[PDB]
Amino acid sequence: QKTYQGNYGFHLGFLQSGTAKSVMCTYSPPLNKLFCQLAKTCPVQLWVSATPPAGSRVRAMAIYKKSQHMTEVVRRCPHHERCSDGDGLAPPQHLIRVEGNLYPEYLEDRQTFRHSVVVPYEPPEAGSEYTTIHYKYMCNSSCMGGMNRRPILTIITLEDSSGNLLGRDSFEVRVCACPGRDRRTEE
Ligand SMILES: [Zn+2]
């Protein structure tokens, strides 16, 4: 999916990580793909070249990468949906959750029925040039009944208070047991 830096120069950033066997979350710049373990927090950076209007929001949503599966809503597999690992905020069917934010909104589109999690857009902290949001994926890419080995993309959109699109940028994701190993291979 095409990126849209838009009027505010919106784009994502990821900390530099290696491919060590014990790494729990590692991003690959050449593949623009995030490799992470189940339920492990992944810090994603939000960069802008100009401050967005007040009341702006940041939405995260997963879609299947391959054309033939793109219309299918991405959800947790039945097994994980019933494992009772809820934090009291996120519905059990949602794949993506946010951690460390007091204002997450777990939404379900009234027309497409796709899931997403939204948090307020907040400026970078003192002496910082990016904002960090911590995301976690509650299902493995291999989960049958779920993503079933189908690659997904995580679309991050910057929206105004009215829900209008301001910016967009995405990355592929693979939720596996050994992020370090899989990254080097795919690379
Ligand atoms: Zn699962």
Side-chain angles (χ1 to χ4, degrees), residues 1-20 22-187:
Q1 183 175 182
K2 301 283 188 179
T3 59
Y4 182 56
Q5 297 217 335
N7 299 142
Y8 299 100
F10 178 75
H11 69 273
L12 307 172
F14 278 86
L15 289 177
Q16 196 189 316
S17 289
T19 56
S22 71
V23 67
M24 314 186 312
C25 177
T26 179
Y27 175 76
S28 169
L31 301 175
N32 179 38
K33 181 167 180 173
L34 174 68
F35 293 87
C36 62
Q37 290 173 10
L38 177 69
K40 293 294 181 175
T41 279
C42 310
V44 178
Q45 310 181 322
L46 307 184
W47 294 72
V48 292
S49 57
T51 306
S56 290
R57 297 145 65 73
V58 184
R59 184 191 304 272
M61 171 189 278
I63 64 169
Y64 283 115
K65 182 185 179 181
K66 189 167 185 175
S67 180
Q68 64 178 62
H69 304 126
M70 201 172 281
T71 66
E72 190 182 318
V73 173
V74 183
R75 55 188 305 160
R76 307 183 67 194
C77 67
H79 172 63
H80 279 122
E81 182 188 313
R82 297 185 294 261
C83 68
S84 303
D85 55 19
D87 53 5
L89 308 178
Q93 311 88 327
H94 283 51
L95 174 66
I96 310 343
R97 300 186 183 174
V98 174
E99 119 177 359
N101 196 292
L102 298 180
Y103 320 100
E105 287 172 43
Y106 288 90
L107 309 168
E108 169 186 288
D109 194 75
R110 301 280 164 166
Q111 297 175 55
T112 72
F113 298 102
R114 290 176 185 287
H115 302 155
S116 70
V117 57
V118 174
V119 302
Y121 168 76
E122 49 178 50
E125 314 200 271
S128 186
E129 24 229 318
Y130 62 80
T131 299
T132 300
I133 294 64
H134 297 82
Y135 293 110
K136 61 174 54 185
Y137 298 81
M138 307 309 291
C139 245
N140 293 303
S141 292
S142 62
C143 284
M144 299 182 282
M147 296 180 271
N148 189 32
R149 306 185 177 300
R150 290 174 292 180
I152 69 93
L153 300 178
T154 289
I155 307 307
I156 299 299
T157 52
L158 176 66
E159 307 173 358
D160 63 16
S161 61
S162 296
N164 295 308
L165 172 71
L166 295 184
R168 181 184 62 247
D169 193 6
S170 62
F171 57 88
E172 198 172 318
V173 181
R174 178 182 170 68
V175 185
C176 50
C178 315
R181 175 168 54 62
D182 295 335
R183 173 183 167 182
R184 349 207 324 162
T185 66
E186 297 199 5
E187 282 194 358

